[PDB]
Amino acid sequence: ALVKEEIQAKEYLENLNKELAKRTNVETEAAWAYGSNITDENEKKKNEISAELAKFMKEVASDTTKFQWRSYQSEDLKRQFKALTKLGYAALPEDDYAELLDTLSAMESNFAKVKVCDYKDSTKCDLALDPEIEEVISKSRDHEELAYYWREFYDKAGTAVRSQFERYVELNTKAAKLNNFTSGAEAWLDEYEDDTFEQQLEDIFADIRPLYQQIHGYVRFRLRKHYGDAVVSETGPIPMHLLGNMWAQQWSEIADIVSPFPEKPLVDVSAEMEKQGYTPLKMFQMGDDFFTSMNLTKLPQDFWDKSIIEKPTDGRDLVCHASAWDFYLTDDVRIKQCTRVTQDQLFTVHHELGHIQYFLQYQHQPFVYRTGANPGFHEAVGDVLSLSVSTPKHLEKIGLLKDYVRDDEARINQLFLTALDKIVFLPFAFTMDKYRWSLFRGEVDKANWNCAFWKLRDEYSGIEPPVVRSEKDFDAPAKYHISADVEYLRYLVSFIIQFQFYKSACIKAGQYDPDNVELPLDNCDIYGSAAAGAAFHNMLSMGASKPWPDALEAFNGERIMSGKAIAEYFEPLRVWLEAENIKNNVHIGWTTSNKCVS
């Protein structure tokens, strides 16, 4: 009978969760070793452990059918059993799973191993994306130099793995269908536990899109004054290599040439960080300080002993794309970051430490609940702190911003600088998964795969490649997450919900009042706030034990993902920018790009 079985099932879950944590620890260790030190030996080891764990997962999914779990009284037990039925890639036949793993590591290792030749010196061909190529993209204002580095990187990180990417799509689709999702798109979307999630995002994106259009138009206007009309047209998409980022995902690196008020202060603390002798260790210690100041959890000794916070100086290949790692024991959490002493990197440190804090907050939960309420929640945590860290308020406290006068013009500069990160990123993030969804769903013929990518980048972001591309090129995998098979919608969700978290944290901290001119949202610092920290504790400690609206409710009493908070943050900028574009007769919108030949 069922009452006796449900008692038996509870004990089954308790043991199985612990077993899964321990087995995942072993896989995670091998994945960490490979990412920290890319070799054929470490690749083989990583993939073989994964194959072994996949086999065990198959038996787990099979064993769930021995329990009448859908009949149980406990919502908690049912939720745990449902999580265990979800096999993902592990649903694939043994041989197919091994091939997928080989395909995945081929793409990630290709990306990580990319090296290009110096623009000025064809002798020197050891320039990696991080830091050599990214240094040029962010700092050079030589448009032909920029175009050279763009072409070299995309050819090597993108085009080189076309055939591998094609097989990856095939096996991803096969895995999804074995789990009875239509495609990998539905498999990914399942993490949000909401059958209207795509529509919800379309609705939020549509509300914020007009503001992006205004920012786009103004940036294009300002770039025309810098580079001239031969380089930048008034009516066409912006040549993406001029935007200070390899993927044009955020434009803050060109703030010095596009800022609303160039005679007024623009916050860029990198030089002061260097002058004051900042190190990666110091930056991580400061991040730790921020969390503990909020009455949240101190980094454990294992973090300091085991993390990699600087790029290794030996010859070795590794993945430098910053990541945070949970090892599923107690207090074994780590970051791998090729840390540089810059303002942007100080934000990255806090972002990654946001993941770490989430790990620590839910490590007491059963294994299946030791993950984010949804993938967007995990990406949001550290960004909430980074929003505070970025304020003139906070940066003056820590002595990184000197002689700053916060008048109306300086406020617009700072709001615009933030928007160059936060608003600009939204269409970018949406396209990363719109693209992959369309391939997963079989909506694009293989003959049209590359221009389908650039079509989306044009349609949503109004950017284009510096040179003519065709179906001979394959540019999508030049973005880390695409080569590494990391879902990207999490970041769109994050950039929306992080403002919901920030607004509420600021209100709880007594740092934001919409009717008090002295407490604007865009200068809120939650440092030292135990009240803000309590909200984080309430939400993060839940892990994935409840559907995400319950996790949001625990933070601030709300249950709905909403664009209200992000729009509220940028409202003063919207008012000023709409008026400034009219004043300057700024053309808005763009013609269809000519940069991808069919």
Binding site: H321, A322, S323, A324, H351, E379
Partner: peptide, 4 residues
């Protein structure tokens, strides 16, 4: 868990 990776950076954007």
């Amino acid at each position: 868990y990776i950076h954007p």
